[PDB]
Design a protein around this ligand. Structure first.
Ligand SMILES: COC(=O)c1c(C(F)F)nc(C(F)(F)F)c(C(=O)O)c1CC(C)C
Length: 134
């Protein structure tokens, strides 16, 4: 077992706040904001050895990343940014930093009660997206 295993499973989005504003700050265009903002993703998190896989599945896109904690990787995001990503596990929180074009956004994933809470930050704008087990 590992501490990280409280994230493993299949999660469904139950609430979102300020996601349109977060996407605007990231630079997402109008049409993608509208369709992606309507999405109700499931988040599938699995661990096999040192490799963590996180999939976001929705009517908009199916996206999947696999990574080792602390080891940078190239990621194509749902809005088609080509970013350099590093994910670490710091005090029980998965911290995902994406770098591109001299910009940075950080996505934190935390367990709180029976929720998995995703906090997304860009240039002072936060979105909070709350998931529960499927
Ligand atoms: C900048 O926004 C994104 O990168 C993004 C977009 C959007 F860019 F298209 N759409 C979606 C989804 F709702 F469509 F799934 C997600 C998501 O996984 O929730 C994300 C990831 C984000 C919550 C950190």
């Amino acid at each position: 077992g590992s501490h990280m295993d409280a994230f493993v499973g299949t999660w469904k989005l139950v609430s979102s706040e300020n996601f349109d504003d977060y996407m605007k700050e990231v630079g997402v265009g109008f049409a993608t904001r509208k369709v992606a903002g309507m999405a109700k993703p499931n988040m599938i998190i699995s661990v096999n050895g040192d490799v963590i896989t996180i999939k976001s599945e929705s009517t908009f896109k199916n996206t999947e990343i696999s990574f080792i904690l602390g080891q940078e990787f190239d990621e194509v995001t749902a809005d088609d940014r080509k970013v350099k990503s590093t994910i670490t596990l710091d005090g029980g929180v998965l911290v995902h930093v994406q770098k591109w074009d001299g910009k940075s956004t950080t996505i934190k994933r935390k367990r709180e009660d029976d929720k998995l809470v995703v906090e997304c930050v860009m240039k002072g704008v936060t979105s909070t997206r709350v998931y529960e087990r499927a």
